[PDB]
Design an enzyme around this catalytic site. Structure first.
Site, PDB file in Angstrom:
ATOM      1  N   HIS A  41      -0.772   4.561   2.992  1.00 43.63           N
ATOM      2  CA  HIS A  41      -1.018   5.448   2.225  1.00 43.63           C
ATOM      3  C   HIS A  41      -2.182   5.228   1.202  1.00 43.63           C
ATOM      4  O   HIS A  41      -2.467   5.804   0.673  1.00 43.63           O
ATOM      5  CB  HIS A  41       0.511   5.106   1.105  1.00 43.63           C
ATOM      6  CG  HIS A  41       0.785   4.107   0.330  1.00 43.63           C
ATOM      7  ND1 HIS A  41       1.514   3.263   0.388  1.00 43.63           N
ATOM      8  CD2 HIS A  41      -0.340   3.470  -0.531  1.00 43.63           C
ATOM      9  CE1 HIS A  41       1.482   2.219  -0.589  1.00 43.63           C
ATOM     10  NE2 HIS A  41       0.429   2.435  -1.328  1.00 43.63           N
ATOM     11  N   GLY A 143      -1.649  -2.306  -7.524  1.00 41.75           N
ATOM     12  CA  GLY A 143      -2.480  -2.771  -6.692  1.00 41.75           C
ATOM     13  C   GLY A 143      -1.742  -3.793  -6.277  1.00 41.75           C
ATOM     14  O   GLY A 143      -2.389  -4.796  -5.493  1.00 41.75           O
ATOM     15  N   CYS A 145       0.670  -3.262  -3.649  1.00 43.46           N
ATOM     16  CA  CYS A 145       1.081  -2.721  -2.303  1.00 43.46           C
ATOM     17  C   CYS A 145       0.321  -3.732  -1.364  1.00 43.46           C
ATOM     18  O   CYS A 145      -0.695  -4.011  -1.474  1.00 43.46           O
ATOM     19  CB  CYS A 145       0.402  -1.373  -2.354  1.00 43.46           C
ATOM     20  SG  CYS A 145       1.281  -0.237  -3.452  1.00 43.46           S
TER      21      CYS A 145
END
Length: 301
Positions: A41, A143, A145
């Site tokens: 993603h 942030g 991820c």
């Protein structure tokens, strides 16, 4: 003595953490040998996220669209690839700090350590369990991820989680290091139902055995129960069934305290039917299901 929420030392994972930028998006990557693994993603725009075709978006990308940073050193990208929902970026330099590791897929009720990172840097380590409904109750901010979950078995790191998203409930979903989501969840901005959770029976019992070892034994009774007798109570209160495997697993703590597994199932039966009666077990007015029998044995023997 003492029984506490305890994580694996994070050092060997810290050494693997890097920052991955695709256009306007920055998150964390795991750098093992000459491959950096991160959520795919990372290649999506805000727009894209509603309805991503990851195949077409990655076809359209070049190795130059990916900026990878190990501290303040740039790692040249020389190849890019998808495996399920993880992006794999081939870089020109093998991570010298790569440890012995494996990619494992865990089940509900298994615990792991999370190293929450931002911009490829480590913020902190905490412990959590895979929920019955294939989510985790993490502590994540924007942030985060690409942060990973892991266990350490001697020198060997077993990577079992990569963080992809937070659901409207404010709980967390992600993948194994092969990019296969835990649970029905998708890296698309859609309606996604966390899906009613339940309690981890074998873990609660593990926690009661811990309680006992640390001198907390008020909830121990003379009553007893059969397995099928236990589980009929369990289903009523949204607890998971207990199986002979779970019984076996608890065997050593039982041996340790001399308290038969099914006798503990009789203590727990009572607490579910009567309540704690204004009481606390290890200070809690609640029963703790995110400690495994393994985690208890590790700390309490």
């Amino acid at each position: 003595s003492g029984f506490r929420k305890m994580a694996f030392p994070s050092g060997k994972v810290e050494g693997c953490m890097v920052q991955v930028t695709c256009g306007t998006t920055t998150l964390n990557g795991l750098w093992l040998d000459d491959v950096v693994y991160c959520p795919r993603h990372v290649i999506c725009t805000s727009e894209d996220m509603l309805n991503p075709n990851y195949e077409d978006l990655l076809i359209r990308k070049s190795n130059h669209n990916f900026l990878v940073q190990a501290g303040n050193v740039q790692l040249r990208v020389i190849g890019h690839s998808m495996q399920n929902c993880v992006l794999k970026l081939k870089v020109d330099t093998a991570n010298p700090k790569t440890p012995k590791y494996k990619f494992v897929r865990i089940q509900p009720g298994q615990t792991f350590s999370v190293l929450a990172c931002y911009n490829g840097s480590p913020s902190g380590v905490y412990q959590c369990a895979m929920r019955p409904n294939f989510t985790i109750k993490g502590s994540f901010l924007n942030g985060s991820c690409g942060s990973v979950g892991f266990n350490i078995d001697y020198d060997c790191v077993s990577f079992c989680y990569m963080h992809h998203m937070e659901l409207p409930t404010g709980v967390h979903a992600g993948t194994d290091l092969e990019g296969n989501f835990y649970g029905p969840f998708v890296d698309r901005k859609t309606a996604q139902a966390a899906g009613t959770d339940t309690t981890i029976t074998v873990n609660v019992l593990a926690w009661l055995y811990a309680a006992v070892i640390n001198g907390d034994r008020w909830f121990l009774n003379r009553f007893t129960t059969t397995l099928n007798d236990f589980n009929l109570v369990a289903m009523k209160y949204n607890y998971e069934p207990l199986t002979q495997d779970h019984v076996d697993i608890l065997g050593p703590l039982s041996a340790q305290t001399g308290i038969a597994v099914l006798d503990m199932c009789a203590s727990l039966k009572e607490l579910l039917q009567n309540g704690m009666n204004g009481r606390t077990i290890l200070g809690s007015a609640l029963l703790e299901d995110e400690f495994t029998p393994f985690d208890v044995v590790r700390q309490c023997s």
